[PDB]
Amino acid sequence: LQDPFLNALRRERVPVSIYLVNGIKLQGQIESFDQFVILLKNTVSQMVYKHAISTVVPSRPVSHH
Amino acid sequence: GQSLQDPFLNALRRERVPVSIYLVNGIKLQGQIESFDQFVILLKNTVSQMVYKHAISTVVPSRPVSHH
Amino acid sequence: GQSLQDPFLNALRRERVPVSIYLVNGIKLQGQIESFDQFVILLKNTVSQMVYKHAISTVVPSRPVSHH
Amino acid sequence: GQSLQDPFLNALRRERVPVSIYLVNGIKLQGQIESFDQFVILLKNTVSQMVYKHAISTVVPSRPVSHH
Amino acid sequence: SLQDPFLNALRRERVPVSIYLVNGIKLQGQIESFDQFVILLKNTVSQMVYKHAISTVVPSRPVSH
Amino acid sequence: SLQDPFLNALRRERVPVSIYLVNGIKLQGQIESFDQFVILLKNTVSQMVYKHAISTVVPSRPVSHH
């Protein structure tokens, strides 16, 4: 599920909120990802460890089918 | 079976039972379990949000649901 | 057994002992251990809730129970 | 032994030294180490409680104890 | 696959970074080296940061990865 | 590995360190020994610190890990 969901967000350039386990809310677009990290683009590309993410919330409905 | 987690989540998914998902930082999410895999649960309410299982403390059904 | 964890939880399950499960954020869950697998514990109170072991700090029986 | 844990915790167990186990949320537990396995430590006071190692930050003996 | 090129770009360009930990605390410095498990972050001393404790690595200015 | 040379230099040079835990708590002492799972940190007693609970190990003064 992870891969089609993140790929849809990536492909469609959908703004997302990535909530971290620490409660911090990151915002941007998903640039790329692998099994361990997501690169989130805003003013810079930042590397987010999946182990530190609680939830990825699209700003609008997007199909992952 | 070897897994209890899988029949539990599947029953909640199949019966479209509203759940509360409490995260390790105490935040509460709500919705219906749309799908899940080894690492994540897709929780539906206004959008589908992808919740990492490693960030979940407990999944609490809003009403009794059989997982047998 | 091969572990302490399995006979400890099974003794609590079999004897239907009320327990407290303390989560890593500090919150206290209470109920009886219905079942468990490698990753979760099902805790019964008004509903069965699924508790991820990764989110648990301790399991405390409400009264001494032998795990031997 | 397959980690420094093993002799350190076994010394504390065999000598029945009171310990503090500090958890990842800052909580301090106290008791004696009854036993441990790959994933948990059983900590004895009035009851045996099961403490998941993943939730522990430190184990601190109340007085010096050789682990050699 | 993505961590190596991302961290190597920051290392070779000596770009100041912010490393936010799983508790939300921000460390700052330059990436000196890294392996599968840790990042060595230099400021006044070299400190060793466990990747398991990192949420996000944020360059202070855009850097191509 | 970078961990092993870094921690071994601190151990051998008996450099006081600060170990910051994942909850932000600061421990101080000297590194007595370590393996893949724990660091034994000495002050008045030897305490066993799980590496899974550590965020950072910070030497109190510069030490070469080369």
Curated annotation (Swiss-Prot), chain E:
This is RNA-binding protein Hfq. One of its GO terms (biological process) is regulation of translation, ncRNA-mediated. The chain holds residues 6 to 70 of 102 of the full protein. Hfq expression was decreased during the space flight and expression of 64 genes of the hfq regulon was altered. Likewise, several small RNAs that interact with hfq were differentially regulated during the flight. The gene is hfq. GO terms for cellular component: cytosol. It comes from the Bacteria. GO terms for molecular function: identical protein binding; RNA binding. Homohexamer. Residues 4-63 form the Sm domain. Disruption phenotype: Drastically decreases survival in host macrophages. Cells display drastically reduced virulence in vitro and in vivo. Mice infected with the deletion mutant show no signs of illness during the course of the experiment. Belongs to the Hfq family. RNA chaperone that binds small regulatory RNA (sRNAs) and mRNAs to facilitate mRNA translational regulation in response to envelope stress, environmental stress and changes in metabolite concentrations. Also binds with high specificity to tRNAs. Plays a central regulatory role in the microbial response to space flight conditions. Is essential for virulence and is required for efficient invasion of non-phagocytic cells. Keywords: RNA-binding, Stress response, Virulence.
